[PDB]
Amino acid sequence: HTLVWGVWVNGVDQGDGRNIYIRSPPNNNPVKNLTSPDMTCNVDNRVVPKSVPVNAGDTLTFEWYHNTRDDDIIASSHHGPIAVYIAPAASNGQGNVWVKLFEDAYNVTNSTWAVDRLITAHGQHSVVVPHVAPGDYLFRAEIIALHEADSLYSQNPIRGAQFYISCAQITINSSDDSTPLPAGVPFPGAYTDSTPGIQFNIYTTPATSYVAPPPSVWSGALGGSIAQVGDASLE
Ligand SMILES: OC[C@H]1O[C@@H](O[C@H]2[C@H](O)[C@@H](O)[C@H](O[C@H]3[C@H](O)[C@@H](O)[C@H](O[C@H]4[C@H](O)[C@@H](O)[C@H](O[C@H]5[C@H](O)[C@@H](O)[C@H](O[C@H]6[C@H](O)[C@@H](O)[C@H](O)O[C@@H]6CO)O[C@@H]5CO)O[C@@H]4CO)O[C@@H]3CO)O[C@@H]2CO)[C@H](O)[C@@H](O)[C@@H]1O
Ligand SMILES: *[C@@H]1O[C@H](CO)[C@@H](O)[C@H](O)[C@H]1NC(C)=O
Ligand SMILES: [Cl-]
Ligand SMILES: [Cl-]
Ligand SMILES: [Cl-]
Ligand SMILES: [Cl-]
Ligand SMILES: [Cl-]
Ligand SMILES: [Cl-]
Ligand SMILES: [Cl-]
Ligand SMILES: [Cu+2]
Incomplete structure (x- = not known):
């Protein structure tokens, strides 16, 4: 259970973006139905009034929270991967338009899932803005919590992989x-349901075996990180 508070650009807080430049849902409940339109940008997908200006090569940082800013971020039970996708704003997220800019699942050295490191990062994870056409874009940040992903939602709707999905309006x-x-x-x-990484038992299968759901990260992507870039408490 987690939501995006806002974003930073090059280490500078852009301010509370909720229902402003983030297409925020009304609460932090997961999406689980793989076929629902809710998978696109969560349950209240509509144009919000602002779009954050960035340039190619800037660092764009999503900042997540649980109940209040810079709190426990997401429950530690919710081990899983994190991805970021991009699509042109004109699509409204419809059609074959989402390109993967970032994937982090499990860090063998550190023995931590992306979610574990997200908490340590105070909710912050980043991508570097790619050299795409100038214009308006949606950046779709996605956390998959796997604590009940041994089951499939389609088969048992009280379990399944959980998707915490947030779309930011970004102008390049x-x-x-x-x-x-x-x-x-x-x-x-x-x-x-057959996609690798959707059904997985994190309790009895080694994390080293986990494969995140495709698509693979675009060769044009400039990377990214899960790491605190800014201190919210100093505001
Ligand atoms: O190592 C020895 C052997 O281990 C075995 O593996 C076990 C494993 O040990 C066990 O841990 C695991 O059980 C998991 C369950 O399958 C799973 O269902 C359960 O999910 C919890 C989850 O942990 C918890 O975080 C979650 O809390 C939710 C809560 O449901 C929700 O209502 C609340 O919502 C509030 C919002 O957060 C708040 O913002 C808003 O204001 O209010 C909302 C409403 O109050 O959100 C929280 C999250 O923040 O709940 C679910 C339960 O619903 O997690 C268990 C693990 O923690 O199962 C394994 C199998 O038994 C191996 O199998 C064996 O081989 C090993 O030897
Ligand atoms: C999943 O979403 C599809 C498409 O919107 C819908 O038809 C189906 O009823 C949903 N499943 C559940 C359990 O609500
Ligand atoms: Cl839960
Ligand atoms: Cl609700
Ligand atoms: Cl759902
Ligand atoms: Cl579908
Ligand atoms: Cl604007
Ligand atoms: Cl450039
Ligand atoms: Cl950090
Ligand atoms: Cu949760």
Whole structure:
């Protein structure tokens, strides 16, 4: 159970974005139905009034929280991966348009899932803005909590993988468009019951065996990290 408070750009807080530049749902409940339109941008997908200006090569940091800013972020039980996708805003998230910019599942060295490190990072994880065409974009941050993913929602609707999905409206201003955006996957649609990483038992299968759901990260992506970039408490 977690939500996005807002974003930072190059280490500078852009301010509370909830229902402003984040298409925020009314609460922190998970999405579980893989075929629902809720998979796109969660349960209240609509245009919100602001879009955060960035340039290619900037660091864009999502900041998550549980109940209040910079709290326990997400329950520690919710071990799982984190991805970020991008699509042009014109799509409204419909069609084959989502391109993966970031994937982090399990860190063998550190013996931690992406979620574990997200908590340690005070909810902060980042991508570097790619050299796509200037214009308006949706950045879809997705946490998959796997604590009940031994079952499939489609089979048992009281269990299943949980998806915490947040779409940020981002305007890319300066960019030479040297890596124009390739084709995307659909949400809903990309994840099905057979997809690797959707059904998995984190308790009896080694985390080292986990494979996150495709698609693979676009070769045009400039990477990213799960790490605190800014101290919210200093505001
Ligand atoms: O190592 C020895 C052997 O281990 C075996 O593996 C076991 C494992 O040990 C056991 O841990 C595991 O059990 C898991 C269950 O399958 C799973 O269902 C359970 O889910 C919990 C979850 O942990 C918890 O975080 C979650 O809390 C939710 C809560 O439901 C929700 O209502 C609340 O919502 C509030 C919002 O948070 C709040 O913001 C808002 O204001 O109010 C909301 C409403 O109050 O949100 C919280 C999260 O924040 O609840 C679910 C239960 O519903 O987690 C268990 C683990 O923690 O099962 C394994 C199998 O038994 C191996 O199998 C064996 O081989 C080993 O040897
Ligand atoms: C899952 O979503 C699909 C598509 O919206 C819907 O038809 C189906 O009823 C949903 N499943 C449940 C249990 O609500
Ligand atoms: Cl839960
Ligand atoms: Cl609700
Ligand atoms: Cl759902
Ligand atoms: Cl604006
Ligand atoms: Cl950190
Ligand atoms: Cl550029
Ligand atoms: Cl589908
Ligand atoms: Cu939860």
